[PDB]
Design a protein around this ligand. Structure first.
Ligand code: ZN
Lengths: 71, 112, 73, 173, 77
RNA sequence: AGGGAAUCUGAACGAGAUUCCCACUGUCCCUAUCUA
RNA sequence: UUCAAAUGAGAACUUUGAAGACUGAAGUGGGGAAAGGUUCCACGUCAACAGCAGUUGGACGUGGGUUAGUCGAUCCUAAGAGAUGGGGAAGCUCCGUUUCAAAGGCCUGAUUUUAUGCAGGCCACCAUCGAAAGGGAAUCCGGUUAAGAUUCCGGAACCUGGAUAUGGAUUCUUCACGGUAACGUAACUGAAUGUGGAGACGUCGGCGCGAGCCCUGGGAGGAGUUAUCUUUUCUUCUUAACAGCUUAUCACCCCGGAAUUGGUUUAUCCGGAGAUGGGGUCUUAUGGCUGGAAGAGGCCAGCACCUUUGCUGGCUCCGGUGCGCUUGUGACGGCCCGUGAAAAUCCACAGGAAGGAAUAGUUUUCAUGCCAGGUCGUACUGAGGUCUCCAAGGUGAACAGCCUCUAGUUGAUAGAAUAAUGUAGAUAAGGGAAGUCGG
RNA sequence: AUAUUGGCGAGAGACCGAUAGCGAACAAGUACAGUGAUGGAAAGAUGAAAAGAACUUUGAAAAGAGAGUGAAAAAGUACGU
């Protein structure tokens, strides 16, 4: 996940099972003040949902990761 | 001498699952799924491939202009020009047989 | 394998072809039970599960099916 | 997504035909037009007339979807229904032969008021005075009318009364 | 990808203001059978598809790079 | 550029059957040796 | 199987290098449907299991791992199933699938003439489920991980739906014209209703054409063998989706009128219901050039290095060939009274309702421009014991074998002996069924 | 008044005492077996208190020998007798 932050400019979140791609794009844009290029989702083998949130070129995922708390 | 796999999930040799072995710019052979071939539109009266109409997938006719889907005559995009000719002749002479039958009918009534 | 997971009892006894559960009788409204199958009755009776609502009925009756709120003595 | 149906989206849910408006309201054409007169609702012109239809080039008038969709919940429509109930329940009394109960049905009759219908139409007073242009032209015509079987004398006397009130004020201030 | 064998058409595309970058590609090719020459390739990312311009001449290339808007980012090769 | 000839059976037959004539062989006289 | 080295307390069994073999494209190869459910990968580990062992694992413990507007499901219907209306049945529930059901969804209007209570018309079958191999809008190439790829990245695309904006057209103002014709076009309105095409369809045979594979000549690089002969053996020399022009058998149109019977196939059918001939039209199959695109991939070479340290130059070209194999397509000819699923979806014609001008007439199937595309599956395995796809070469008359290239294995307890017996296979003096019920 | 092997809640026994008493004193309607309906186990006790063996030595480690805790390891999770 930390590799995917730096290279592809992609934030990796654990999203709840009920929420779709519109709701992830809306959630990130609301909470983190950052526009989203695309969201890709997959159901994890354990039963939860992973989400690959790629941000637009005007925003950096490394900076926002240092902004929230995880690095 | 590269051997080649199916690309989509169907492992079977159906009508939809045809294969063209194509050489890629990576210097290797790989399969290409062949789109199911378009047919000629046909004469509704004749049963023959009518000239001047584009041959496309059914859905693919929506994108193209009306000048690729119709020839300029009456019954243009649906008939032959031979089958149009034949029904111009037929509708004329049937319409004139009606006149002759009225002439005979009016004459027989005058006789009675 | 003729059978797949049931929705009502989740026992994997929903016969695929017949489209019915051989254990609980889904989707016929009445849950399948027989007097000759007394052991089978014990496996699926009230009490085997959670009793989310039916636990507390005795408590509520003992109190006299009372509404409102306590008033701080 | 699945391939969306063509003629159900953009101009097809933005506008509706007269027939579709009448049917949706479950109201008579007359009463649809009566509410349309009161509410200040008019047909609107789309940029595509055939995309506003379901493909057809046809003689059609288009209303605004959200306008009719907003008319549906309204006290005046409910009061029109109440007038219809009153109409049959009166002719029940009259048609039988009892006159006293019919006369009593007149006493126990409320009517629709056009009070709240103006607040939503002309919210500011200067906006109402921008409409009074066309409003005073009807009313001053209807003062200068002989009463017929179409139009009762009470109607013309009340209209003339308002006319005289208007003339009195303009000559006052 | 689409061929435009048309000079001012390319220059109309460059001043669209929805265009960020351009590219000038240089090639080494030979005519008929005799002599080697230098080919240029003027490519813009258009509104939908990429438009390309083969100019076999070197002087017309020399004029065209000069004739581009100076604010536009130009890429060699 | 394995035989051959008869016969019993349904004139050749059919891996039909039997008998004989010719050839062949460890089946035997009589076993001996080698390899797996 | 062996030799060497590394790891470890410990090595026939772990790993690496070397030798020997085995599978020999009808693989012990690489993919999938089903099925399994984390077996995939890493680190830690040997308590139990993998019938010897083990430092190894399809084991154990802890973590990591499956990303889609274009691939599937999702949609449609098939054979069938199954509610509703009805009718049985003490009943659990069964019959029945359009039936003697009031099964509903659209248009017209100055507001409907005893005054503001809705009139007239159009259409006549029937919910739904049922396919991850049937029908179906649209995505490729290169790159990327310990493990994910048509899903991620870079590049380049396409489809569908929706608002709308501009240019062009609609001609002296009101729905364009050329061609004898087949038909051609940047457009060139078309309601109810009626119809047609695609979807959309049995099987084989030879023949034509195309793509991939195979064989090969020249040339531009590298690896090998060489005492001898050999311009030798091996390897690299690549071109995706999509896009712009262009390329055609068949079929049709005009001229022409034929026996002295002609044309013509591999296969004897074709012609006064118009042959040969002369001239044209059409579909874009499939090829060619161009763009994508050489900027990528490949083969080399030279120059820097504790180093997360790569850079700099080249070449990446020109051809040929077939009773070949694979596959795609075209025109024919047989085989039948066997006449060759359905539906969703898309297009077209007939029709002639309505609409269309003087401070933006009507119409956008013409060109350009804008936005958006949800959910679930996606890991891996898939080997007397379920289904399925791809398929190199040589010698030889050969589908006989024998040998190999690509790729993948070396797994199955080991070691020490080697007499008789037993099973199986050979050979044998002389004689030639004398054996045995019976070569 | 009467019935009441279910439910809610009590009180009792000349009853059984872990192969008994319910199938189940316990991760029991559990593990597991079966396509499925169903079938369906085994398994209680250290000590008063973990005080569950600090530390040293032998071994790659499990463990062993010392040492210690305890009234007792002739109670060391393989634990009452
Ligand atoms: Zn059940």
């Amino acid at each position: 996940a930390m590799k995917k932050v730096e290279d592809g400019n992609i934030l990796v979140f654990q999203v709840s099972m009920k929420a779709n791609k519109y709701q992830i794009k809306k959630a990130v844009k609301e909470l983190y003040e950052v526009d989203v290029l695309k969201v890709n989702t997959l159901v994890r083998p354990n039963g939860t949902k992973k989400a690959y949130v790629r941000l637009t070129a005007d925003y950096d995922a490394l900076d926002i990761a240092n902004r929230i708390g995880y690095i | 001498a590269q051997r080649v796999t199916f690309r989509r999930r169907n492992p079977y040799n159906t009508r939809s699952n045809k294969i063209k072995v194509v050489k890629t710019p990576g210097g290797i052979l790989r399969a290409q799924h062949v789109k199911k071939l378009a047919t000629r539109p046909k004469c509704g009266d004749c049963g023959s491939a009518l000239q001047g109409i584009s041959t496309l997938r059914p859905r693919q006719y929506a994108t193209v202009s009306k000048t690729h889907k119709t020839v300029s005559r009456a019954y243009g995009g649906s008939r032959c020009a031979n089958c149009v000719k034949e029904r111009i002749i037929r509708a004329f002479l049937i319409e004139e047989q009606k006149i002759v039958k009225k002439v005979v009918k009016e004459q027989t009534e005058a006789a009675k | 394998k003729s059978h797949t997971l049931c929705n009502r009892c989740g026992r994997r006894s929903f016969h695929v072809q017949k489209k019915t559960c051989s254990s609980c009788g889904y989707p016929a409204a009445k849950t399948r039970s027989y007097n000759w199958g007394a052991k089978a009755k014990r496996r699926h009776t009230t009490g085997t599960g959670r009793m989310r609502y039916l636990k507390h009925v005795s408590r509520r009756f003992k109190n006299g099916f009372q509404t409102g709120s306590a008033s701080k003595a | 997504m699945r391939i969306k149906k063509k003629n159900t989206r953009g101009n097809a849910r933005n506008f509706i035909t007269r027939s579709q408006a009448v049917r949706k309201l479950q109201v008579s054409l007359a009463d649809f037009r009566r509410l349309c007169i009161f509410k200040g609702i008019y047909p609107r012109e789309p940029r595509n007339k055939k995309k506003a239809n379901k493909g057809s080039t046809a003689p059609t008038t288009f209303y605004y979807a959200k306008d009719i969709q907003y008319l549906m919940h309204e006290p005046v429509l409910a009061k029109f229904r109440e007038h219809k109930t009153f109409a049959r329940k009166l002719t029940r009394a009259l048609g039988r032969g009892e006159v006293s109960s019919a006369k009593r049905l007149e006493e126990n009759r409320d009517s629709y008021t056009l009070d709240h219908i103006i607040k939503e139409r002309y919210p500011s007073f200067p906006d109402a005075i921008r409409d009074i242009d066309d409003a005073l032209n009807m009313l001053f015509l209807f003062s200068n009318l002989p009463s017929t079987n179409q139009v009762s004398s009470k109607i013309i006397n009340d209209a003339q009364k308002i006319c005289n009130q208007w003339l009195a004020y303009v000559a006052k201030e | 990808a689409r061929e435009i064998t048309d000079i001012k058409q390319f220059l109309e595309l460059t001043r669209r203001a929805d265009v960020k970058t351009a590219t000038v590609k240089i090639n080494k090719k030979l005519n008929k059978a005799g002599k080697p020459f230098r080919q240029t390739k003027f490519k813009v990312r258009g509104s939908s598809s990429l438009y390309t311009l083969v100019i076999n001449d070197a002087g017309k290339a020399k004029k065209l790079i000069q004739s581009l808007p100076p604010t536009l980012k130009v890429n060699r090769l």
